[PDB]
Symmetry: C3
Subunit: 150 residues, 3 copies
Amino acid sequence: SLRQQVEALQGQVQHLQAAFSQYKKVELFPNGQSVGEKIFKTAGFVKPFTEAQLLCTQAGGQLASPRSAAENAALQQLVVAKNEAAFLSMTDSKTEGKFTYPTGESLVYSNWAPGEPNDDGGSEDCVEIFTNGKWNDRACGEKRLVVCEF
Amino acid sequence: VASLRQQVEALQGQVQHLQAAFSQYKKVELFPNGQSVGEKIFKTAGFVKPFTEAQLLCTQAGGQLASPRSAAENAALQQLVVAKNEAAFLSMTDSKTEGKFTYPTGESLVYSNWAPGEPNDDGGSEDCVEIFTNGKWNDRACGEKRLVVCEF
Amino acid sequence: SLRQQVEALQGQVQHLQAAFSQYKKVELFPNGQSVGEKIFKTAGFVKPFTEAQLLCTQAGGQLASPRSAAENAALQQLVVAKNEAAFLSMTDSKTEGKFTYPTGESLVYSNWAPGEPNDDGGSEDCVEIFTNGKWNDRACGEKRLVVCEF
Ligand SMILES: OC[C@H](O)[C@H]1O[C@H](O)[C@@H](O)[C@@H](O)[C@@H]1O
Ligand SMILES: OC[C@H](O)[C@H]1O[C@H](O)[C@@H](O)[C@@H](O)[C@@H]1O
Ligand SMILES: OC[C@H](O)[C@H]1O[C@H](O)[C@@H](O)[C@@H](O)[C@@H]1O
Ligand SMILES: [Ca+2]
Ligand SMILES: [Ca+2]
Ligand SMILES: [Ca+2]
Ligand SMILES: [Ca+2]
Ligand SMILES: [Ca+2]
Ligand SMILES: [Ca+2]
Ligand SMILES: [Ca+2]
Ligand SMILES: [Ca+2]
Ligand SMILES: [Ca+2]
């Protein structure tokens, strides 16, 4: 009967997989985007960098950190849909000119708009992504769309 | 051997936890922008868009525009429309053949809840369908903006 | 061969646990809070008590019912985030001066602001929670943030 149980439990698990897959699609509409094993989700409102960063970390994730063209495109979809530029997780607060992820690791991908980053004004240590997907270093005190990744 | 037995017993415990946890999250997830009816789930985006844009949003999300195929589904959909107090677009149109409304697949309707006198192709240019807060349907110009509600 | 059958099932279950865990974080961000086996979720808008109560009940849950300091703090987080006081499920509509849960039992926990409840104007049978986490009885006809528990 052990084989029978495995047969039965697998039926329940595959039914669970089906239900879960459906609820996942529902979950991401319309404020989320999945790319690979990563999920981006916007809070739907704007906040300064520090507050946005805290919201994501307290939620068990971190600010959007596109590490490839594919991830950047998925994130771009949310920014376009909300029509609001969003903050990324990277900053060059430690070493001006050198942007890093929250862990301190150097960028493995970038999509800077022409002429960026320019540390305009002498104090732009955060990064925002435009509706066109391009990046721009921006003053961390400005308010931008909050998008976290999980 | 008994090793497999122990593993099956372990799997049963993990599965029961997932089922209970998932049962709770289903309710949490659908509050307040979703409605479950049978094996279908309606989810509103909370904003309005013209038909073509609304349709694209749903298809890109892995679903399609709300397609109520029974009174029960139509009532579930109506709940979201009433909550947002915004009439919504359905997926059906008679863009191909005037007077013949079909689902995106091309199949003819299996259920309808037209308000009296509808569809009337008003102005000779209404190929889309909207559902009112009272649950009744009305054919409407696809260029108009209505609440976006997808089904999954 | 049963071993290879169980082995396949184990793979599915382990993947589901990981996928479900990631999804839980996505769902709770930014309108939910999990504390113990309870989950609070705000609709993000305000409604009078009766309408708020119906929304929660029809959703398969009930209005926020903090039963401990831990739960109250979790609920408070949502109130603070939305900067809108929220209705709790308890009322003393049946017997003035005696607040009870929807079931009818008396409170097992409370966090009343100084001087409350005071049945102001002789007509406050509902309860709101402030951004400071304290409670105040309020007219059920007033509109407050809708927060349900599941
Ligand atoms: O964050 C500020 C922006 O980088 C802005 O800076 C300068 O004013 C110019 O280089 C603009 O073209 C650029 O868009
Ligand atoms: O979509 C437009 C509606 O059909 C509208 O059209 C006309 O104006 C009349 O027939 C109305 O009674 C009807 O409600
Ligand atoms: O809900 C109404 C509040 O209790 C309010 O009532 C009265 O106006 C006074 O007792 C205030 O100090 C108190 O804050
Ligand atoms: Ca600097
Ligand atoms: Ca800088
Ligand atoms: Ca710049
Ligand atoms: Ca036509
Ligand atoms: Ca028509
Ligand atoms: Ca019409
Ligand atoms: Ca009273
Ligand atoms: Ca009272
Ligand atoms: Ca009071």
